[PDB]
Design a binder for these strands. Structure first.
Lengths: 60, 60, 62, 60, 60, 61
RNA sequence: UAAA
């Protein structure tokens, strides 16, 4: 798995990320946690993002 | 599983949440219940939403 | 597991409730749920059509 | 399985069908064969349709 | 499997094909090769197309 | 498997500039740094992780 | 950063 180390490194070092959804919309925040299906993305509070709806994840 | 505690917290408290679908549609209501593949969202109606059609679940 | 979906669709089927099925592409289908399995729902209006669940976003009583 | 008897009846009886795709397009033909993943649809030509791209199948 | 025979027939005879994607884009060329998840489509250059994105494969 | 991995591995090893077209039509560009069963790491200014479920086509630029 |  490249995905888990890539996300764990963004999580562990509290890096700001942009998550682009499959419809083009860009979300931003920090990865609080993730599992096989979802990413919890936190600003004030965490929204839950389904991985099946994500196209790309980048630091920024 | 991160989904179950995340959704059960919203369900127990009956707070408003926005469910954004992969096609951009925003649904607004309370999480009435859920299972492995669907969420029941309650406003003036109770509607069953397939998780495969959901991008994000965002507490209001 | 399926403890929500199956009783929700079965109740609609049993009581012949007019339903709306919204597809992910935005189209609204209407009819009665005649039956369903793991992957499809049979929706009856003038005739029965097989709707793939993977194409569906929402199901609600009309 | 409801899917398999539904499609087999159309196939065996040579029923003209409309297959609606997830982008709204309607294809028309007779079902030549199908498996877990695809339906082969015959009109003027033979074409392979992936089930994941189908929303609806109905006799025309 | 209906895919392997269908696609091999096109590959073998060098049939010009249209590969329609679920988003409506029409790709055109000849089938160079394929596996369980992708089709290699050759025209100006050789492009790898994910089957999960394909709606239909049809002669041009 | 037997076609996907050699295709992507050759692009990776020679550091070929590639175009990755997403299902929403957007075109991404960069170098394939690495890949696994579910994602491609795509390198340009930064490294971004691209989910394969969101990709329609991969082609050298 | 979005179609109550």
């Amino acid at each position: 798995s490249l995905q888990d180390p890539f996300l764990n490194a963004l999580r562990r070092e509290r890096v700001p990320v942009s998550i682009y959804l499959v419809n083009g919309i860009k979300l931003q925040g920090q990865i609080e946690s993730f599992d096989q299906f979802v990413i919890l993305l936190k600003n004030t509070v965490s929204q839950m993002v389904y991985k099946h709806a994500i196209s790309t994840v980048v630091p920024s």
